[PDB]
């Protein structure tokens, strides 16, 4: 028992960081197969960087201005790209480290682990979710661009996230693999915001059945409701708007506790109208919403991955 | 900026780990060069358990009683021995996968990174502290024993923590890696209790110092105090004293904020006196006691590790 943020390991995305360098630029590539993947943004000059022009960056460059480094062993560029936001760094040397991988776009609600890289090295591993308002809120310091977001399927990393900025309330922006922003940003240098954040409501839903599931029951109660009266609570607190295939995913939840969806849902709506009362749920004394359903699963049941 | 529950990188450990399996039990092993380490109870029947003596438990076995698997590689065990609370299984083939480590002990209030496996195959990763009652609030289930605990300094991983069980208020009990375990707890399925904790404090005003970094001031006040008094405060709220060691370990966060060490204290005061006014401070309701100074200025300054 016990619930914690709990990443995946880190292991097989760890032997897939490089540095690369260009110009007065540093920060980090994923090196799969025979390419390195980046954050285009590294092609810009401080000044460049108001308003670039990344084709006109980027035709400006040559295969010896990429400085790709793989601990202390630089890797020859012998082409490049840009895909969307992203560099793609075709090196003569292929990653004998490549896991089985895939790059997948997530939605928001998903969570994912993050590895913090500066340099080409990890620096930390921890867990985030894709927030509604596509931000995540991570831990980034310069340098830390390129580092990557991922979920793993047995033995296979799916890569999700690329970092590649921050926003002013000190909440974090990027792309897939694939160079696409989560969300509206662009990579510029000029004034962007966020937007209104709302609460993940399956996932807090979740995190109540973790409790459960660990023995925390202080909430529970012997009400319950209807989907459109808990949606119209939602709505008063900022909560995201919960469908049936929401309900549908929480069923195995609701199945090992025996506290049907609704029956949740009505213990979420006293929580939400009264508070905790000076209460903590799973050490915490705020709803959490980043964990999923099959968070909540997987740590709960143990599944392991090779 | 941003600031989370950060584990270190878990690939140098993912390479050690293997499944033991003796009889009718698995759990999690060590491989270190040509080591196996492995919670004693391994040996266990469901029937020795409740009162065992693990000596003659041993000392019953034989070398090809033990299953060490390496992935789909078995082992082969070469010899035995017990240090206090942990198994060395001698094998014939060295860990090529073996990095630089050391066996420490820790101190409560010290943080580390769980690497949580099972059937030998990592599962998860997530950060714990050595509580003052020599417990950690981890997240385990059955088969997860033998999972360690690891701080990572430059290249080098300093082990801290096996995992052997779980009290009855949810929370873990472990050793270091040379089987002693942290607090009064017995490798026994009988009657024990963790004891009365207390919270961090070092640690609170450390993550009350990453607050300040992180721009989130909305807590700090005009006030000081004096070691003595705030000590009385501590008292009364169930904190640990705070020590002159503590406030010289506080000193580099103080510098970079600018706030001194009693001022922060005055903060922590005023705090514990009031509650937080439904408000949060990094992204909690409550004050939080697992992170270290060392953990803030890692994560506030991006260290990273080869
Ligand atoms: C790459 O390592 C770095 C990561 C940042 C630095 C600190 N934490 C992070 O996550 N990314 C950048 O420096 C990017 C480069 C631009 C993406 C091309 N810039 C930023 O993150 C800046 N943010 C920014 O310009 O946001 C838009 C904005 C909003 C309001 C006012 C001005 C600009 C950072 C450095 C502020
Ligand atoms: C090893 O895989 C396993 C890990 C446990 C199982 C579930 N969560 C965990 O962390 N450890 C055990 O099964 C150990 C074996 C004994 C150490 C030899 N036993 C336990 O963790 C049990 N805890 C326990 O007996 O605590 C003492 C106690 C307290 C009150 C009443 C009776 C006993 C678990 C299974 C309850």
Redesign the interface.
Known sequence: ????????????V??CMVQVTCGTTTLNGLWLDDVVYCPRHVICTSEDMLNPNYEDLLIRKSNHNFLVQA?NVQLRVIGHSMQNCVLKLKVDTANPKTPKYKFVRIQPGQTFSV?????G??????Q?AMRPNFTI????????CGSVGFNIDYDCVSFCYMHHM?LPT???AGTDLAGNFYGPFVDRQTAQAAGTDTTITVNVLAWLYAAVI??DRWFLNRFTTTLNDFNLVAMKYNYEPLTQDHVDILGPLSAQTGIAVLDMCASLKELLQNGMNGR?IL????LEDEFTPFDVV?????????
């Open positions: 028992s016990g619930f914690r943020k709990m990443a995946f390991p880190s292991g097989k760890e032997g601990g590895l913090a890289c500066y340099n090295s990890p620096s930390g591993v921890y985030c809120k991570g831990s980034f310091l310069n340098g830390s921050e000190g909440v974090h660990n023995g903590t050490g915490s004394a705020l997987r740590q709960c049941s143990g599944v392991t991955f090779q």
